[PDB]
Structure formats: C-alpha cells, structure tokens
Amino acid sequence: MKAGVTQTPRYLIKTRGQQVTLSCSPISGHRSVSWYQQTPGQGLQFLFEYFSETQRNKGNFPGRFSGRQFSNSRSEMNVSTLELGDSALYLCASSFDSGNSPLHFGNGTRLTVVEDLNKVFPPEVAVFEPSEAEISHTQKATLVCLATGFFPDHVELSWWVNGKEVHSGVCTDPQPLKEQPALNDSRYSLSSRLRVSATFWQNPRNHFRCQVQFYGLSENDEWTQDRAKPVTQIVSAEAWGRAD
Amino acid sequence: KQEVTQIPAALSVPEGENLVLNCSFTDSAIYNLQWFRQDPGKGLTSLLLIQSSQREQTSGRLNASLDKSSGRSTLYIAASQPGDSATYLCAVTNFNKFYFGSGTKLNVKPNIQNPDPAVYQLRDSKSSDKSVCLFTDFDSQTNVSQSKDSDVYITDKCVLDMRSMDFKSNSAVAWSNKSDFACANAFNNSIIPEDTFFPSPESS
C-alpha cells in the first residue's frame, strides 16, 4: 500500500507580492525533511532541512523563504512577497537520516507566479483521426491529440480506450512548445500520439479519449474578464473507430 | 566553495551501449555522494548512495565509483535501455549544506528494425482549425528540425512502443492553421530519408 512522500498543493498560480504555504508529509518512519527549489536556470537548490521540529541546515535563500516542522514530522514552507523568478518546482525529500541514508523525493508543488491572472488560459484539446494511407501501408493507425493555447504549463495529458487508461502505443512530448518562444507569458502547446492496429481502429465500437487536466485559478481568485474564468478543469476530445 | 560539475550535459546513444556519467566536486570533505534519476514532470529517485568511507556501490546495471580525495565519482550504466532515459543528478552532502549538479540528460534510442519512413496527413478535426502532418517510422539516426516558419509547430521525435506486436516507432508531429501549409512541405527544413513515402494526398 505504502504512501510515498506526499506534497500539497500540487499546483499554484499566484500574482506578484502574494504569499504561499506548501506542505510535505515524509514517508512513515522518516524524520528528516528537506526542501529544494528547482528552476530551469539554477537547477535544484537547497532551501533547508528539519529534524524533530527544528531547522538543522539552511541554504542561501533570503528570509522571505521560511519553514517549520510539526511533531509528527510533517513540514511546511512559506514564501512571501512572491516574484516571477520564484516560479519553480518546490520539492520535498524525506530520509531516515540525510547524513547516511537515501533521500526520497515527493513530486513537488509546481508554482507559477504571473503579473496578471489575465495571462491564464486553459488548453483547447483536439483529436485527429488516422490517415487512410497509413492504414493501407502499415496496417496500423496513429491518432494525434493536440493541447494548445494554455498558460501556465500546469497540464496532465492521458489517453483512455473504452474507459481504460492506456500507455502501450503512446508517446507524449516530454515538454510543451512555447507558441511565442520569445515571451515570458507565451502560451504553450503539447502533442501526443496513440497508435493501434488497423483492425482495432476499424471497429466502430472502440472509443478513444484524450484527456487534459488543467490546474488553474482558485474559487477565491478574482475574475473580471469577459471570457470564462480559467479554473481547474478537464478539457477532452474523443473519437470512435470506423470502417477506415 | 563547493562546486559540483557533471559532464556530459546531454548524451544520446543507441540502446545496448554502455554509458559513462561523470561527476566532480571541489571540496573533498563530504559525508556521502548520491546519484538520482529524474523523469520529465516528476521528482527524483535515489539510485545509489556511496558513503564517504566507501569506494563503490552497485545496483543491477548501475555501478558508481567514489574517489573522495580526487573529488570524483563515475556512474557506469551497462547495456542501456530506453527506460534509462532520464536526467541523472549527482549530489553531495557536506557538513551543513547539500549540493546538486546540473545533470546529464540521457536519451537512449531504440534500434528500429524495419524503418518505413513516411509523412501522412491526418484527417481534418471538425472541432479544430489546425492541419496536422505526421512524420513516422524513420530510423533513430534521423534528426527532426524546427520549421523555417514561426507559425508552423513541429515536435521532436517521440518513441512509442506497441509491446504486444514487438514493435516500436519514432514520430514527429507538425501542424499549423495557416492556409499555405501542406504535408508535402511541412518537414522541408529537416534532412529526411530519401525514400520517405509521401502518399497522394497525405502530402501534396
């Protein structure tokens, strides 16, 4: 069963000047909890480590980055006066003893700091059905899913065939592409492929769904634009097989 | 004063080859050195922990040496597999600090048994305004370039595995919503195999 390191929240979008508090629960039995910031440009940087409710070691971040640990070993970190360059993956690691025992990492809190919540957009999602020529030439059929126009990069794409999540025959790009590479606030696009046999695609009872979860604004974020508030949501597209 | 360096920054190789990942550190006063892997969009996984008193650790196909006085560790990965593709991070624990290197980004390419390079046009979506082209089934030596056009989007080769058919394939996707765009031209900025199949009209 066992729970790994857990982190909450998974995703956050904030504006400049705001503050956030992040939580981490270690693996049961681990008492050392460490925080790290991962950015593209500076890689993993140590924040601080806690053991038995006290800070044991600290990195070089300024005092607007702070932390604590509760009696059950759970740890919080807090960042005040947020700036665009605080956008990062905030990673937690637990260990039985960081001096001599492995670090076990959580999957992080993804924080994006933006100037303006008007910069936030959910993805549009589309499925493109296979080429007849592919089917004739190879006896295989590739579907493509495109997730486009989103900001920030807070998406998870998955494929489902007859209601069951598939990994065989899938490849999703490891990173999205910036639609406007030069801009800090560029929207993103992501592509994925699902390849099946021609026989499987040719059955009209087979149902294919590309699902994109987008983690966006909170209930508590103000919204005064005309377009739909870009809240946390799923955007999906689907197709059914056909004699093809 | 600790500085951790990793080379190469990026490694791309054919599956089956052995690999060498290098780490160095300027301050020899370390408690342990630890190697990790990180996949896109995930946290890190500990692979090996070498205590300051140990000279090496092995786990499966991974073996790492530690030469503390020289300030070096080398990770050897035997007989590489596609599922080894990841970022590999070197970290050291100092008296009261922890330092990570910048990583080696490893891509282990499949050997494509039966290349069948082709560019196909996927069907128009009635709920999208984009046109989409698929370059597929090429060998792993093929490099996919970005378009000359800023409004044509091309994503790098991605490998899919159809496990039950004993089959793997590379593909790259190109799309646009401009009207002077066709699959025949989509990959014109890439060096593609001369025998690439352009069906009429999964192309132009």
Author numbering:
A (entry chain E): 1 to 244
B (entry chain D): 2 to 205
Paper text:
The key molecular interface that enables T-cells to sense these threats is mediated by the clonally expressed T cell receptor (TCR) that classically distinguishes between self and foreign peptides. The TCR governs T-cell specificity by discriminating between self and foreign peptides presented by MHC molecules. One key feature that is likely to facilitate this level of cross-reactivity is flexibility within the TCR complementarity-determining region loops (CDR loops) that form the antigen contact zone. The finger-like CDR loops of the TCR are thought to meld around specific pMHCs, sampling the peptide cargo, and enabling T-cell triggering by ligands with sufficient affinity/dwell-time.
We generated 12 structures of the F11 TCR, that recognizes a peptide from the influenza hemagglutinin protein (PKYVKQNTLKLAT) presented by HLA-DR*0101 (DR1-PKY), between 1.58 and 1.89 Å resolutions; 5 structures of the DR1-PKY specific HA1.7 TCR, between 2.31 and 2.98 Å resolution; and five structures of the 003 TCR, that recognizes an HIV-GAG-derived peptide (SLYNTVATL) presented by HLA-A*0201 (A2-SLY), between 1.26 and 1.37 Å resolution. Indeed, the CDR loops of the third TCR included in our study, the 003 TCR, were superimposable in all the structures solved. The 003 TCR structures, which exhibited practically identical CDR coordinates, were solved at an average resolution of 1.31 Å. Finally, none of the 003 TCR CDR loops, which were identical in each structure, made any potentially stabilizing crystal lattice contacts. However, we observed several CDR loop re-organizations between structures for the HA1.7 and F11 TCRs, while all structures of the 003 TCR were identical at the level of the Cα backbone. In order to determine the appropriate Ecut for TCRs, we performed rigidity analysis using the 003 TCR at cutoffs of −2 kcal/mol and −3 kcal/mol (data not shown). Analysis at a cutoff of −3 kcal/mol, but not −2 kcal/mol, demonstrated that the structure was largely flexible, with very few large rigid clusters. Although this analysis is an approximation and should be treated as such, the average maximal loop motion was slightly less (6.4 Å) for the 003 TCR compared to F11 (8.7 Å) and HA1.7 (9.0 Å), consistent with the structural data demonstrating greater rigidity in the 003 TCR. On average, the 003 TCR CDR loops moved slightly less compared to the F11 and HA1.7 TCR CDR loops, in line with the structural analysis.
